[PDB]
Amino acid sequence: KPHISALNAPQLDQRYKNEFTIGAAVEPYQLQNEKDVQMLKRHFNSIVAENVMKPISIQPEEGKFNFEQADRIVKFAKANGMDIRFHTLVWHSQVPQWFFLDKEGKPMVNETDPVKREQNKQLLLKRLETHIKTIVERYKDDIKYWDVVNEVVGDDGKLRNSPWYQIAGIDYIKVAFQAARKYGGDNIKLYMNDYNTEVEPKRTALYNLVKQLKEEGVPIDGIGHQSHIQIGAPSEAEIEKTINMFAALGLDNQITELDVSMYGWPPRAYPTYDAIPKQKFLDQAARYDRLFKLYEKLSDKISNVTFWGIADNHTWLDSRADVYYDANGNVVVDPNAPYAKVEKGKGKDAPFVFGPDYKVKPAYWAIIDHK
Numbered sequence: 566k567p568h569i570s571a572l573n574a575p576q577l578d579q580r581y582k583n584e585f586t587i588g589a590a591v592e593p594y595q596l597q598n599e600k601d602v603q604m605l606k607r608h609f610n611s612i613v614a615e616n617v618m619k620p621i622s623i624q625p626e627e628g629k630f631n632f633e634q635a636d637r638i639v640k641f642a643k644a645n646g647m648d649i650r651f652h653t654l655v656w657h658s659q660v661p662q663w664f665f666l667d668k669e670g671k672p673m674v675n676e677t678d679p680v681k682r683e684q685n686k687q688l689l690l691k692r693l694e695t696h697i698k699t700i701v702e703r704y705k706d707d708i709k710y711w712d713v714v715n716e717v718v719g720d721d722g723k724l725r726n727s728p729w730y731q732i733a734g735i736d737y738i739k740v741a742f743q744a745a746r747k748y749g750g751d752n753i754k755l756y757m758n759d760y761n762t763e764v765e766p767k768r769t770a771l772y773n774l775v776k777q778l779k780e781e782g783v784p785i786d787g788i789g790h791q792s793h794i795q796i797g798a799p800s801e802a803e804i805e806k807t808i809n810m811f812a813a814l815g816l817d818n819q820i821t822e823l824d825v826s827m828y829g830w831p832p833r834a835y836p837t838y839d840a841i842p843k844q845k846f847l848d849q850a851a852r853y854d855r856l857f858k859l860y861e862k863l864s865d866k867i868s869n870v871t872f873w874g875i876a877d878n879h880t881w882l883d884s885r886a887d888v889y890y891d892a893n894g895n896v897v898v899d900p901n902a903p904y905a906k907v908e909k910g911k912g913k914d915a916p917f918v919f920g921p922d923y924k925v926k927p928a929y930w931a932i933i934d935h936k
C-alpha cells in the first residue's frame with residue numbers, strides 16, 4: 566500500500582458512485598490552488614462551502630448580500646458536474662448580530678414587555694424569511710441539498726436556547742423550512758444538520774422534533790449527520806442505530822462534515838503533523854475501514870458522504886488541537902496525565918484519507934479497496 570500521490574490514485578467518488586456521492590468542504594482560495602483543484606476534479610463529485618455560505622458571510626449587514634465567494638464555489642461545481650450542498654441557512658454561530666436587535670437597536674432577548682416580545686418574534690421571523698428567500702431565489706436551480714437549520718437541538722436533549730429560540734421559539738425552525746420550500750420549490754432537498762446525532766439524549770430529541778415537524782406538515786427531507794468523530798467513538802453500532810431510526814421516519818441521511826480526529830475530547834494534540842506516531846494512522850485506517858463498510862451496508866439510506874476538507878494540510882480540527890506541556894516543556898498527549906500549560910489550537914490533527922503532501926494515507930487504501 567504505497568504512499569503515492571493522490572493525483573495518481575484510483576478515484577474515490579468512482580469507487581462509491583452507486584452507493585453515495587463523495588464530497589468535500591472548500592474555501593474559495595483552494596480553487597486557486599492547483600493541487601486542491603486537481604483533488605476536487607479527481608476524487609469528488611459533491612461540494613460544500615466550509616464557510617462562505619454561512620449567514621454572516623452572505624448577509625453581514627441587513628440588505629448587504631455578498632454572493633461573490635459563494636458564486637465561485639457554485640461556478641466550479643457546475644463546471645465539474647458536482648452536486649452542491651448549501652451550508653447553512655440558519656445557525657447560532659457565524660450569524661450577524663443585527664438579526665437579533667429590536668427597532669431601537671436593543672437585544673430582543675432583553676425585552677420583558679410581552680407585547681414587545683411578540684413584535685420582535687414576528688420581526689425576526691420576517692428577517693429570516695427574507696434572508697432565506699434571497700438566497701434560495703438565486704440558487705434554487707443550482708443547489709440540490711440544503712442544510713436549512715444547523716445545530717438547533719442541544720446536547721441536553723432540549724432545543725438549543727440560542728437567540729433564535731429565545732426570541733421566536735420553535736417557530737424559527739418551522740419558518741426556515743417553509744420559506745426554503747416556498748422559494749426553492751419541490752425539487753430542492755431540505756435537511757436539519759447536527760453533530761453528535763448518535764448520542765442520547767440528543768438523538769431521541771432530534772428524532773422526536775423532526776417527527777413532530779413532519780406531522781405538522783413542515784417540509785424536511787433528511788438529516789445531516791456532521792460526523793465529527795474519533796477513532797473509537799461513536800461505535801459503529803451506534804452510528805448504525807442512528808441512521809436506521811432516522812431512515813425509519815422516511816428521512817434521507819447525509820454524512821455532512823466527516824473527519825476522523827486522531828484525538829479524544831478535549832483533544833491533547835501533537836504539535837506538528839510529523840510528530841504523530843505512525844501507529845495512529847493505522848488505527849485511524851482500521852476505523853475508516855469499519856466506517857465505510859457500514860456506510861455501504863446502509864447505502865440505501867445514505868445519499869452522500871462529505872468530508873469537512875480535502876487533505877490534511879487544511880482542517881478546522883487544528884483550531885481544536887490544543888497542545889499540553891508539562892513542567893519540563895515536554896508535550897503531553899495522555900488524557901489523564903499532569904501538565905503545566907496548554908497552547909490552545911496550536912497543534913495538528915490528521916483527519917482525512919489524503920496526507921498534507923497530497924499523498925494517500927493508510928486510510929485511503931482501507932476505503933478504496935473491496936475488503
Ligand SMILES: O[C@@H]1[C@@H](O)[C@H](O[C@@H]2CO[C@@H](O[C@@H]3CO[C@@H](O)[C@H](O)[C@H]3O)[C@H](O)[C@H]2O)OC[C@H]1O
Binds near residue numbers: 615652759760791822
Ligand atoms: O475566526 C473564525 C473561525 O472561527 C471560523 O472557523 C470556522 C468555524 O466553522 C467550521 O465549520 C463548522 C464546524 O462545526 C460544524 O458543526 C458546523 O456545521 C461547521 O459549519 C469551519 O470549519 C471553520 O473554518 O472561520 C471564520 C473565522 O473568521
Ligand SMILES: O[C@@H]1[C@@H](O)[C@H](O[C@@H]2CO[C@@H](O)[C@H](O)[C@H]2O)OC[C@H]1O
Binds near residue numbers: 760761793830
Ligand atoms: O461548535 C460545535 C462544537 O462544539 C462541536 O464540538 C463537539 C462538542 O461535543 C463533543 O462531544 C464532540 O466531541 C465535539 O466534536 O463540533 C461542531 C461545532 O459546530
Ligand SMILES: [Cl-]
Binds near residue numbers: 879882
Ligand atoms: Cl478551517
Ligand SMILES: [Cl-]
Binds near residue numbers: 920921922924
Ligand atoms: Cl506524509
Ligand code: NA
Binds near residue numbers: 838839
Ligand atoms: Na510533514
Ligand code: NA
Binds near residue numbers: 592615879880881
Ligand atoms: Na478551513
Ligand code: NA
Binds near residue numbers: 854858932934935936
Ligand atoms: Na475496506
Ligand SMILES: [Zn+2]
Binds near residue numbers: 568922924
Ligand atoms: Zn508524505
